[PDB]
């Protein structure tokens, strides 16, 4: 469940922290809000390695470009490079991305599909939890939201995802990118799913397990005279 929306003087991103393999949870605390530049972030949905690899690739190139041009990197640059690279691979890099940031041109919010289509928007959601999120965003989004409002709406859109979508779960990560300020990354912004204390401790009496042989492993380099 990934989302982003614009507010008065910036843009905000939200994401859940669940990774799935078929029907099992592979990860309960993964970061879906990837770094591209200091003030450009990318929410990732779809094939996990694909979303992670394509944001790292473009983020690496945006850094070399920033160095080369002696300028703050623009969101439309990250947008173009993600979109041209996904397009080249005709969907086979199964990455669904929400791009947002501040640059010298102002604040920006874009969605990117696996085949290389881009959308412009004031509020966007992507992934299995996107309909749960888009229902909250379509109920409560207005123009000139304050930051306190924006963070409430974004985190409510991800919660819709967590509760109502099996594909989404665990915690809410948020990233705030206000104009003329440092972007603030708020990993575990909400923690609404802490496992309740267990009934028992399953710690075994020592010697419970039958052992055939023992040996010391040599991990040091050169045992020496």
């Amino acid at each position: 469940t990934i989302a982003g929306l614009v507010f008065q003087d910036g843009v905000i991103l939200g994401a859940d922290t669940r990774a799935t393999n078929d029907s099992v949870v592979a990860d309960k605390s993964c970061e879906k809000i990837h770094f591209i530049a200091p003030k450009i972030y990318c929410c990732g949905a779809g094939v996990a390695a694909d979303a992670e690899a394509v944001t790292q690739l473009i983020g690496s190139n945006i850094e070399l470009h920033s160095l080369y041009t002696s300028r703050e990197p623009r969101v439309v640059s990250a947008l173009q490079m993600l979109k041209q690279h996904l397009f080249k691979y005709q969907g086979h890099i199964g990455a669904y991305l929400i791009v947002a940031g501040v640059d010298p041109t102002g604040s920006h919010l874009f969605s990117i599909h696996a085949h290389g289509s881009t959308d412009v928007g004031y509020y966007l959601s992507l992934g299995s939890g996107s309909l749960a999120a888009m229902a909250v965003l379509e109920s409560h989004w207005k123009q000139d939201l304050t930051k306190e409002e924006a963070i409430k709406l974004a985190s409510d859109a991800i919660q819709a995802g967590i509760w109502n979508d099996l594909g989404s779960g665990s915690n809410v990560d948020v990233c705030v990118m206000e104009i003329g300020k440092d972007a603030e990354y708020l990993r575990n912004y909400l923690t609404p799913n802490v496992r309740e204390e267990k009934q028992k401790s399953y710690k075994f009496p020592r010697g419970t397990t039958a052992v055939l042989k023992e040996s010391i492993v040599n991990i040091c380099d050169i045992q020496e005279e």
């Binding site: 439309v76 947008l79 173009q80 979109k83 874009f110 289509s117 881009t118 959308d119 412009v120 928007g121 004031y122 309909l131 749960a132 888009m134 229902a135 909250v136 379509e138 109920s139 207005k142 123009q143 819709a160 509760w163 109502n164």
Partner: protein, 233 residues
């Protein structure tokens, strides 16, 4: 085995302190073509039950008839037909859930998902789901098609569990339903603006409102969106 041809989209509904609310748009779709702009998909049975039907309209029109024929049959040699031996919502649901599951088991299903909304003899709320597979489930909020994905999130924010039902008034609940229908109109390409809504309340009975319309639609922000990325004009 068939394939649905003319189809009706989301039916959404919820329990509140005294009764149940159920709503459905007035569209019969023919694939992508928005063919029929006057189709009623909430069918009341007596004064205590509304059956909300989504899927193939021909299979819905058949179920309509089954229910109309059921009222007739229930009257036969039943001096108490309009009192203690009137049809209950639970009796109507169980009839449909029987038929639905027998049609799937003959590999000739009725291509529908059905919410039975109503209030029982004793004033208890009744909300139960049945579809073409004969799968059944009850919840304080129920929705079919897009409404499962978009309406349920919104309606569960009001009634997230059983103990929330007595704290929810008919004004709160209706407002939640009318809002959810607007969401569904923004985001379902096979929905319409013109919808119907029924409240079944254990005091005021069955209110059936026709020709409702989504309003307070927010489009303004559209004027500012230009191109798909780098375009400024």
């Amino acid at each position: 085995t068939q394939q649905p041809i003319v189809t009706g989209t989301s039916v959404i509904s919820m329990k509140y302190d005294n009764g149940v609310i159920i709503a459905a748009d007035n569209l019969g779709s023919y694939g992508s073509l928005l063919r029929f702009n006057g189709v009623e998909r909430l069918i009341p049975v007596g004064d205590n039950t509304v059956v909300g039907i989504s899927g193939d309209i021909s299979d819905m029109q058949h179920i309509e008839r089954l229910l109309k024929d059921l009222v007739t049959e229930n009257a036969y040699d039943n001096p108490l037909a309009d009192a203690e031996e009137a049809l209950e919502p639970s009796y109507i649901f169980e009839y449909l859930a029987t038929v639905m599951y027998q049609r799937r088991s003959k590999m000739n299903p009725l291509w529908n998902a059905i919410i039975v909304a109503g209030v029982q003899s004793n004033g208890d709320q009744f909300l139960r789901y049945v579809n073409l597979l004969g799968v059944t489930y009850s919840s304080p909020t129920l929705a079919t098609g897009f409404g499962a994905h978009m309406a349920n999130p919104l309606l569960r924010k009001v009634v997230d569990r059983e103990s929330d039902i007595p704290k929810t008034t008919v004004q709160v609940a209706e407002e939640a339903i009318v809002n959810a229908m607007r969401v569904l109109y923004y985001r379902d390409a096979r929905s319409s603006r013109n919808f119907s809504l029924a409240i079944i309340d254990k005091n005021t009975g069955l209110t059936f409102k026709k020709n409702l319309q989504v309003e307070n639609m927010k489009w303004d922000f559209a004027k500012d969106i230009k191109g798909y990325g780098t375009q400024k004009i």
